[PDB]
Amino acid sequence: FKESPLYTIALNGAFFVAGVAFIQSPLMDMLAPQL
Amino acid sequence: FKESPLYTIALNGAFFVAGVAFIQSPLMDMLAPQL
Amino acid sequence: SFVRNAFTKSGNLAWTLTTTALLLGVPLSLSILAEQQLIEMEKTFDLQSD
Amino acid sequence: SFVRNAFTKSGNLAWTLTTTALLLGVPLSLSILAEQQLIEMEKTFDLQSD
Amino acid sequence: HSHRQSLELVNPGTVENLNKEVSRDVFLSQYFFTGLRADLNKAFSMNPAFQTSHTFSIGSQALPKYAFSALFANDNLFAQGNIDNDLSVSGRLNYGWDKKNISKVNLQISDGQPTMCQLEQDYQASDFSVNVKTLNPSFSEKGEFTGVAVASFLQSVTPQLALGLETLYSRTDGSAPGDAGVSYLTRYVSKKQDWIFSGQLQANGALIASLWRKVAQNVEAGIETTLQPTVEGSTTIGAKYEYRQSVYRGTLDSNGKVACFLERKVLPTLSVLFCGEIDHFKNDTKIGCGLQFETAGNQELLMLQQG
Amino acid sequence: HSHRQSLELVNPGTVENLNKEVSRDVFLSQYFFTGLRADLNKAFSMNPAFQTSHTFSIGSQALPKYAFSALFANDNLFAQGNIDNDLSVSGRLNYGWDKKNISKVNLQISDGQPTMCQLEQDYQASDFSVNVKTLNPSFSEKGEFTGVAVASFLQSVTPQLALGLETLYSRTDGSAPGDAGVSYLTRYVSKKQDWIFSGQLQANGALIASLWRKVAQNVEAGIETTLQPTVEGSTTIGAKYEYRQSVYRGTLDSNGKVACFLERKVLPTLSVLFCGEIDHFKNDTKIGCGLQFETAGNQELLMLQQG
Amino acid sequence: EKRAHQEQTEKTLKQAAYVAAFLWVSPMIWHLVKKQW
Amino acid sequence: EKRAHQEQTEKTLKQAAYVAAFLWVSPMIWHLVKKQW
Amino acid sequence: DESKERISKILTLTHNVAHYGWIPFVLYLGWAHTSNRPNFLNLLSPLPSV
Amino acid sequence: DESKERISKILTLTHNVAHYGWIPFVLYLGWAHTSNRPNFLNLLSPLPSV
Ligand SMILES: CCCCCCCCCCCCO[C@@H]1O[C@H](CO)[C@@H](O[C@H]2O[C@H](CO)[C@@H](O)[C@H](O)[C@H]2O)[C@H](O)[C@H]1O
Numbered sequence: 001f002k003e004s005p006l007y008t009i010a011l012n013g014a015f016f017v018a019g020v021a022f023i024q025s026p027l028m029d030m031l032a033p034q035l
Numbered sequence: 036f037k038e039s040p041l042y043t044i045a046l047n048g049a050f051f052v053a054g055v056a057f058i059q060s061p062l063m064d065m066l067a068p069q070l
Numbered sequence: 071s072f073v074r075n076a077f078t079k080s081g082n083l084a085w086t087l088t089t090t091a092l093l094l095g096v097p098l099s100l101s102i103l104a105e106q107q108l109i110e111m112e113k114t115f116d117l118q119s120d
Numbered sequence: 121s122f123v124r125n126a127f128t129k130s131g132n133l134a135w136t137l138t139t140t141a142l143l144l145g146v147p148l149s150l151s152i153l154a155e156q157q158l159i160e161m162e163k164t165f166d167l168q169s170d
Numbered sequence: 171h172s173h174r175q176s177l178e179l180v181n182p183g184t185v186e187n188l189n190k191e192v193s194r195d196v197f198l199s200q201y202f203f204t205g206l207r208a209d210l211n212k213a214f215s216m217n218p219a220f221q222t223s224h225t226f227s228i229g230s231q232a233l234p235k236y237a238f239s240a241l242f243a244n245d246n247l248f249a250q251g252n253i254d255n256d257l258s259v260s261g262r263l264n265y266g267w268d269k270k271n272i273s274k275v276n277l278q279i280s281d282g283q284p285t286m287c288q289l290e291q292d293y294q295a296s297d298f299s300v301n302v303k304t305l306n307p308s309f310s311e312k313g314e315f316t317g318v319a320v321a322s323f324l325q326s327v328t329p330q331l332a333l334g335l336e337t338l339y340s341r342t343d344g345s346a347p348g349d350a351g352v353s354y355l356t357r358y359v360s361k362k363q364d365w366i367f368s369g370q371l372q373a374n375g376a377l378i379a380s381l382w383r384k385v386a387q388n389v390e391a392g393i394e395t396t397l398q399p400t401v402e403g404s405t406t407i408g409a410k411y412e413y414r415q416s417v418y419r420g421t422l423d424s425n426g427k428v429a430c431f432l433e434r435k436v437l438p439t440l441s442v443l444f445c446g447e448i449d450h451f452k453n454d455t456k457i458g459c460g461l462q463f464e465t466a467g468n469q470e471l472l473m474l475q476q477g
Numbered sequence: 478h479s480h481r482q483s484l485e486l487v488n489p490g491t492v493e494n495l496n497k498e499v500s501r502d503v504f505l506s507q508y509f510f511t512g513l514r515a516d517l518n519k520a521f522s523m524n525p526a527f528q529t530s531h532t533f534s535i536g537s538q539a540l541p542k543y544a545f546s547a548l549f550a551n552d553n554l555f556a557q558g559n560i561d562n563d564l565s566v567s568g569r570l571n572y573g574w575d576k577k578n579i580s581k582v583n584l585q586i587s588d589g590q591p592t593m594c595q596l597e598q599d600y601q602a603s604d605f606s607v608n609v610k611t612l613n614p615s616f617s618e619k620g621e622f623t624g625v626a627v628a629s630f631l632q633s634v635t636p637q638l639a640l641g642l643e644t645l646y647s648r649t650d651g652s653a654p655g656d657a658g659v660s661y662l663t664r665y666v667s668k669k670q671d672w673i674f675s676g677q678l679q680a681n682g683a684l685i686a687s688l689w690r691k692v693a694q695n696v697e698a699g700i701e702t703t704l705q706p707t708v709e710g711s712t713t714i715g716a717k718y719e720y721r722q723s724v725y726r727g728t729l730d731s732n733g734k735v736a737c738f739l740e741r742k743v744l745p746t747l748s749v750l751f752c753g754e755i756d757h758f759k760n761d762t763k764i765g766c767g768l769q770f771e772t773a774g775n776q777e778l779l780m781l782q783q784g
Numbered sequence: 785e786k787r788a789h790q791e792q793t794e795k796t797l798k799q800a801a802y803v804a805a806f807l808w809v810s811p812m813i814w815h816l817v818k819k820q821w
Numbered sequence: 822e823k824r825a826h827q828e829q830t831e832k833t834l835k836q837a838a839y840v841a842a843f844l845w846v847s848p849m850i851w852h853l854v855k856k857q858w
Numbered sequence: 859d860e861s862k863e864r865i866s867k868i869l870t871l872t873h874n875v876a877h878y879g880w881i882p883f884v885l886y887l888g889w890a891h892t893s894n895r896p897n898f899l900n901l902l903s904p905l906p907s908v
Numbered sequence: 909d910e911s912k913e914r915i916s917k918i919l920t921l922t923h924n925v926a927h928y929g930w931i932p933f934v935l936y937l938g939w940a941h942t943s944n945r946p947n948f949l950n951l952l953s954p955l956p957s958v
Pocket residue numbers: 104139142143146147150151154157206207208226227228434436437442443459460461739741751
């Protein structure tokens with residue numbers, strides 16, 4: 001239990017890393033229609 | 036200068052008669068596309 | 071002066087009439103246009119069939 | 121009981137995911153579909169020309 | 171009662187179907203909403219109709235967030251049951267003893283408000299129409315009625331006119347004797363069914379007069395005028411332009427507000443729809459947007475649906 | 478400065494064009510609006526572009542009710558003048574002394590608030606970019622500066638990277654000596670221009686880091702992360718799927734809100750557009766809907782426009 | 785005092801019933817009037 | 822007291838100028854570092 | 859009276875059965891009068907999963 | 909000083925000329941650099957009236 005400013009820092013950093021891996025990964029390509 | 040209840044009575048009656056004549060008249064037909 | 075009031079009044083009225091006409095006519099215009107296109111497509115498919 | 125809380129939680133989450141998916145996907149689905157139809161029309165006009 | 175058969179009188183519509191053309195078909199007050207909404211109805215069968223509907227909404231006060239409704243309708247019985255978030259269950263049940271006579275029930279439970287259910291009996295003869303609907307009936311210890319009762323009658327004096335009335339008697343508790351309010355009713359259908367007039371002078375002093383006109387097969391128009399000392403009344407003129415792909419409805423009010431409702435069928439299944447309302451006197455807007463999916467439940471209806 | 482010519486360095490984009498792909502092209506924060514809006518732009522000529530635009534809005538706080546804007550753009554000079562209801566006039570003027578160097582002016586008058594005008598000078602060399610923008614300059618009686626000054630620099634250490642900074646010095650009145658805030662800047666473009674990274678550590682302690690990726694020619698994606706003791710930050714991931722008939726943009730925020738913007742070209746002239754934003758944490762919605770007409774002014778452009 | 789209000793509402797309902805009966809009679813009377821001219 | 826704040830902001834601006842000069846120098850230094858390996 | 863208690867009791871019973879059990883009864887009528895008689899998952903799922 | 913009064917005066921003049929006269933000047937530049945040179949009504953009317 002922290003609920004301190006480093007909490008939102010770490011949470012937004014985690015969302016960032018997750019989104020970058022989602023974007024950079026093959027899964028994002030699947031979201032692109034072939035046409 | 037009245038600004039009495041018969042004012043809104045007369046005003047809505049006037050809008051009614053005007054709308055009925057607009058509707059019943061040829062002008063409403065023109066608003067209908069031929070197709 | 072009175073002329074300055076007339077511009078304000080007429081411009082506000084033109085604004086109301088214009089936005090009203092847009093909201094009431096543009097969706098209808100697109101509805102009618104889509105229906106025209108559909109009638110045209112049906113006519114083309116009819117002439118090609120016959 | 122705990123089971124009654126689980127239904128509430130899961131149902132609210134399903135609601136959020138569903139409405140999110142609708143808003144994000146249905147306009148896109150219709151965009152993609154219109155584009156598919158347009159590609160199809162172009163292909164038909166191409167084969168008829170040749 | 172022989173030269174009654176001579177007149178060739180025609181049954182008039184129900185008292186509920188009096189302003190049907192203007193208030194419901196043409197205008198958009200029933201149809202209009204606010205905020206985003208999505209509807210998902212799926213049909214499992216069609217000889218006896220059965221279908222289940224989900225409804226998701228957000229951005230309005232009237233519509234709930236999730237609502238699951240399911241109806242069954244065979245040749246003479248209709249039953250709809252509806253469940254809403256916060257568990258407000260509404261159920262209606264029509265049973266047709268005959269094509270003319272119907273006996274129906276509407277039951278609504280609000281999980282925190284008094285339950286309200288109404289028993290109605292609607293009988294339509296060759297040349298008149300009756301209904302009797304009783305809301306929350308109950309008998310005091312003395313044997314006296316306690317509830318609301320609405321009995322209405324409508325008769326065709328001539329094949330175009332239909333004059334009638336509705337009597338409302340309401341007794342809340344029994345301590346105060348209940349009050350009675352009478353309302354009179356008039357309909358006039360044209361000779362060629364082109365235009366209709368409909369006027370009702372309610373029991374509260376109010377007057378509602380409406381006109382409907384059919385310009386062509388794809389287009390319709392209608393005006394309505396309501397008014398209720400402290401008098402106040404609103405006039406609304408509107409038009410409905412229906413086509414095969416779409417249905418357009420426009421409305422212009424005496425309160426200074428304009429309104430639009432477009433239902434655009436885009437797929438054989440999906441239908442998008444838009445609704446927009448401007449108010450000029452206080453210069454603001456209500457936008458609602460939404461959609462309807464209809465999906466077949468079984469394989470046969472799924473092939474019927476597309477082609 | 479010879480094996481400088483050896484490196485084959487490429488000019489980086491302006492400091493304003495740093496997060497251009499994520500913040501503007503992909504995301505919809507600039508594009509998003511509320512309520513109904515209509516835009517009517519008409520183009521009178523095209524070799525030197527000249528066009529006049531009307532904009533009607535209702536249902537939002539940012540956008541005014543009527544706005545008339547007109548721009549002229551010849552080979553090296555751009556001038557736009559804008560008049561708004563309640564007579565707030567905004568005018569911008571770019572003049573290109575050369576393809577690289579530009580000198581520009583932005584002047585805004587609010588008819589009740591202090592006038593704000595900024596003089597900017599943006600010079601981009603072979604391997605770096607400079608700008609100097611001064612907002613409301615003025616000299617006190619002592620000869621000391623009074624206003625805001627922002628000087629930024631950006632250099633490509635290698636053909637993919639671009640490191641730089643921007644220095645803001647602001648002195649309001651002269652009684653208190655003005656304050657200085659420095660911010661650092663980083664961009665990294667991929668080898669095949671597939672993906673871009675962009676990070677700026679502002680002077681207020683804030684950090685903004687963003688990534689852009691091009692999955693295919695018709696599709697793009699991007700994430701952004703802002704944060705500013707009292708810390709608070711928002712992350713947003715979004716995608717842009719552009720086609721010939723339409724442009725779709727979707728966005729998913731860490732504050733629990735989702736957003737959508739569709740610009741659907743329907744005619745060669747008309748283009749409808751929709752925007753919808755849900756917020757789940759407080760369960761409500763913003764809908765904006767609108768349109769754009771573009772019309773040719775002269776006959777030749779009118780025939781060019783359709784075909 | 786409440787007896788007077790009960791009597792008044794009862795009178796109103798009886799009147800409504802009489803009006804409904806008159807309306808049921810009305811087509812015949814209307815046609816007989818048209819028959820006279 | 823305001824003289825100290827003026828000195829501090831002046832120091833900040835001088836520092837920023839020095840950083841910009843270092844960045845201008847930086848491509849050559851980077852390439853010489855790459856040249857070393 | 860005892861009759862008052864009895865009518866109140868059976869009204870409580872009927873109200874409960876209608877609140878808890880109206881819409882499942884509608885769904886059972888449906889599931890009876892279909893030729894396919896789908897399962898309970900498909901009966902509530904909005905999809906065309908058939 | 910007198911120079912302060914002078915600079916303030918010409919700044920007032922320039923601010924007035926820019927507030928009242930920026931957007932008509934833009935429109936005049938346009939109307940000059942067109943081949944057709946339309947009238948003032950068409951220059952402001954949103955229609956394709958040409
Ligand atoms: C709680 C959830 C809320 C969900 C809210 C989602 C609301 C979305 C509404 C706006 C969506 C845009 O929907 C828009 O509808 C129009 C009709 O007007 C469709 O237009 C359609 O008609 C043409 C006519 O030839 C067909 O080719 C095709 O079926 C389709 O393009 C567009 O494809 C779509 O862009």
